């Protein structure tokens, strides 16, 4: 078991002896080891970068050199490892390349959901998007890099090969509301189409972290899908506050997070089901949630509820690794 910790991607290895996670000394590490670890995480042949950095994880024991426990690293640095170029965008209608991970998911020539690109082949969305009668992958088309719904027509999108819902998804409560779509062909990345980064353990997000949502969702409660892609600012809302008797009264589980503004009609309706809730940290854009439930957008004391992607990242890695 291997993972990347925190916003500086500190490579950590689990120690069965100590039953705890520990950073890798830069000592004798190289790109082949980094690629091996990336493969082990499910990123296949992707590899972005690896460099030594000062350990900002707090740890007190490290893995050196084949790896063994060491109280110190001779190079006094630990491995920072990025398996894919992600979390980059351009630099209230959205500009081309502003939200390049945003996709629109269609059935029967109709926008049904949103999603987020995480690899050339994999999209994060909501499990309730692909609830029957929409569980057949052949029903779906993904449109990437296109801002206007009217330019999302037959031939302009990408066929979907696989739909995988979280195995503990509960449609009754919308608990664990996350799913993966695998495309039949890999996307070509450019200025307009790029992935968002999956969140790492230890993001240490602030209680009311500033986030963004994007999508083609209706602005007006009684309305149709927006023709053009929109985006908006939202603040995270602490789950204990979201679970107030005047908000969602204990419907928010550990697999959910709340975002928006409690007070006033701020019209946070731009998001689509399954679409991204992202935040910028360490100059990287991270996928913190996927839009799940809460129809009363633009309403006081009814913020958006999102699948908590941080707790689903291990499942996502497992699925990506299992493919093939």
């Amino acid at each position: 078991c291997v993972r990347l910790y925190g916003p500086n991607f500190i490579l950590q290895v689990y120690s069965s002896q100590r039953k705890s996670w520990h950073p890798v000394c830069q000592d004798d590490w190289n790109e082949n080891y980094g690629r091996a670890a990336c493969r082990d995480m499910g990123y296949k042949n992707n590899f972005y970068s690896s460099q030594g950095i000062v350990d900002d994880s707090g740890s007190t024991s490290f893995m050196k050199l084949k790896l063994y426990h060491s109280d110190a690293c001779s190079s006094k640095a630990v491995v920072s490892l990025r398996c894919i170029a992600c979390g980059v965008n351009l630099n209230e209608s959205a500009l081309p390349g502003a939200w390049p991970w945003q996709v629109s998911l269609h059935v029967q020539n109709v926008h049904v959901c949103g999603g987020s690109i995480i690899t050339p082949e994999w999209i994060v969305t909501a499990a309730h998007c692909v609830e029957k009668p929409l569980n057949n992958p052949w029903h779906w088309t993904a449109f990437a890099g296109i801002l206007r719904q009217s330019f999302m027509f037959y031939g302009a999108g990408y066929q979907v090969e696989k739909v995988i819902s979280h195995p503990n998804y509960d449609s009754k409560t919308k608990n664990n509301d996350i799913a993966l779509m695998k495309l039949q062909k890999p996307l070509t990345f450019n200025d307009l189409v790029k992935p968002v980064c999956l969140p790492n353990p230890g993001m240490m997000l602030q209680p009311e972290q500033l986030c963004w949502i994007s999508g083609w969702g209706a602005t007006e409660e009684k309305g149709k899908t927006s023709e053009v892609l929109n985006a908006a600012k939202v603040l995270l809302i602490e789950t204990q506050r979201c679970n107030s008797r005047y908000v969602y009264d204990n419907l928010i589980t550990p697999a959910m997070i709340c975002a928006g503004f409690l007070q006033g009609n701020v019209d946070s309706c731009q998001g689509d089901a399954g679409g991204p809730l992202v935040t910028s940290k360490n100059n990287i854009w991270w996928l913190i949630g996927d839009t799940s439930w809460g129809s009363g957008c633009a309403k006081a004391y009814r913020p958006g509820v999102y699948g908590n992607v941080m707790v689903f990242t291990d499942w996502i890695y497992r699925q990506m690794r299992a493919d093939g």
Partner: nanobody
Amino acid sequence: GQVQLVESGGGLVQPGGSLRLSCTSSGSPLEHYDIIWFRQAPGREREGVSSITTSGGHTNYADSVKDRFTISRDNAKNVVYLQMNSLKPEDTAVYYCAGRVGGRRNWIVPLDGYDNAYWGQGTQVTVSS
């Protein structure tokens, strides 16, 4: 709290008549839930007849009730309604509401979704002369 659905409005009516069933909730406001009205008569299988999303923007009807039944909701009043016109002896059954926390996808709620849902206690509807 966990939602508790309560149906009412049933009773005896003549063929051709109308009834308006309604469903409310305790424990948790009804506005959060997608709602399916389904029915069951003794000896027959359960039958979803109508469904509606939390926002009311997608409704769905069984062929057997289309044009005669109309589902609607009033979130401020915490209620979901089923208007049943031109009633028929074959519409006799206990009518139940089934609820799920409602999602945001732009699609109908399937009529067979009562298999994993909160359920009310049902309200008897009898159509006879």
